């Protein structure tokens, strides 16, 4: 029985996709751990596929099983619009995800796009796509057709301006297939192809900038630097005395800033570091992974105060602090163990940002591949049987377009499963919501 095999094919999508896509909206909101720019697009994808599992797929089912459109004529226009609207916001949202990642990976940053521009791009996407899919809403027609003398039956189909003029309906079905399926899958493919080699054959680059008056922080910096070199980093030591602040951090995966503490009844930085601190906003620090060390003397009121001062400025500038600062007491040669320890801890933290990157990059690639393969049938169809215009095999054809349409609807419910399976901070977040309910 074909009607029942499509009964549960369409609703398990509805159910797998409402619960699935409701968890993604929820956890990105309830957990500040999860509020990132990438997850806001991921929740935007989720909100696009929720609009399809609850609005479209429910009324689609009943128009397929019964065969008669039993809802209003307003919905006959709106459900095809709400369906086209979703695939465009999805395609725009995935294309933004791929480019943003590519940009963070060349600038060696943890954010390029701000959390407040990301809301503005999410707006344009719904705005630009609500305009691009309005032909889907206007060129629908509500009227009667009787297959045989069944006394009530009404269908819902597309009607393009001419009585036999097919051209408006194909260029739309060719430009949109072009500008919104092979163009954005072209861009996405290009980005992840570059990103992938990048992530595979990169060497980490470290900048060490210290300020040192009698050589203690300088000795500490040489000691850090010998462990990061032994760890496969390409290390770059610069005395603060010899640099200028503009663009100083650009290109580096890791910046360590070392400074000794000075001053009289107040904290002062080491003297060569003052100009770098006064100009720290021109260095490229937002999104940059940093850490801080310094030499001090626990006799003083604020032991290694300069570290705190720098850590707070870097934090104000929106930099991503990666360890708590290292504060050496006395002669750093007598503290070599504490220093080499610290350096090993910084290295491990960088390995986790790098690993978190690879893991999330490969989940994002699975999402697009499961998107493009699932839309491949329907669009193959759409391209073929919109240059042909001869398909009266509708005992097969209508089934061909539905079973093709069911595949594409799997791109809705699939996304929460990939997150839970292939991303451990999602896995834990879903199970941390099903544990407070
Ligand atoms: C499934 C039930 N059935 C019959 C089996 C439907 O027809 C169901 C429907 C349900 C209830 C009432 C009326 C219609 N219809 C199912 C198809 N759909 C629809 C319409 C448009 C899009 N955008 C694209 O594909 C698309 C995506 C990216 C790039 C280009 C295109 C593109 C668009 C237009 C022409 N070229 C290419 C997707 C859609 F899914 C609207 C409702
Ligand atoms: C005048 C003066 C003020 C100092 N103030 C502090 C301080 O406030 N907090 C602190 O932890 N160490 C303080 N120190 C100790 C120095 O930070 C320490 O001697 C350090 O080793 C100098 O580092 P450097 O040789 O790399 O420049 C002060 C030292 C001097 C001479």
Author numbering: 48 to 250, 1000 to 1146, 257 to 343
Task: Give the article text.
Therefore, NPY receptors have been proposed as important drug targets for the treatment of obesity, anxiety, cancer, and cardiovascular diseases.
In this work, we report the crystal structure of Y2R in complex with JNJ-31020028 at 2.8 Å resolution. To obtain diffraction-quality crystals of Y2R–JNJ-31020028, an engineered Y2R construct was designed by truncating 28 amino acids (S354-V381) at C terminus and introducing two mutations H1493.51Y and S2806.47C (superscripts indicate nomenclature according to Ballesteros–Weinstein numbering system) to improve protein yield, homogeneity, and stability. Strong and unambiguous electron densities are present for JNJ-31020028 in the Y2R structure with the S-isomer fitting better compared to the R-isomer. The Y2R–JNJ-31020028 structure exhibits a canonical seven-transmembrane helical bundle (helices I–VII) architecture of G protein-coupled receptors (GPCRs). The second extracellular loop (ECL2) of the receptor adopts a β-hairpin conformation, which is a common structural feature shared by class A peptide GPCRs. The Y2R–JNJ-31020028 structure reveals a ligand-binding pocket formed by residues from the first extracellular loop (ECL1) and helices II–VII of Y2R. The phenylethyl and diethyl amide groups of JNJ-31020028 bind to a cavity shaped by ECL1 and helices II, III, and VII, making hydrophobic contacts with residues T1072.61, Y1102.64, T1112.65, W116ECL1, V1263.28, F3077.35, T3087.36, and H3117.39. The benzamide and pyridine groups of JNJ-31020028 sit in a subpocket bordered by helices III, V, and VI, forming hydrophobic interactions with residues V1343.36, Y2195.38, S2205.39, S2235.42, L2245.43, L2275.46, Y2285.47, and H2856.52. In addition to the hydrophobic contacts, the carbonyl of the benzamide group and the nitrogen within the pyridine group form a hydrogen bond network with the residues S2205.39, H2856.52, and Q2886.55 in Y2R.
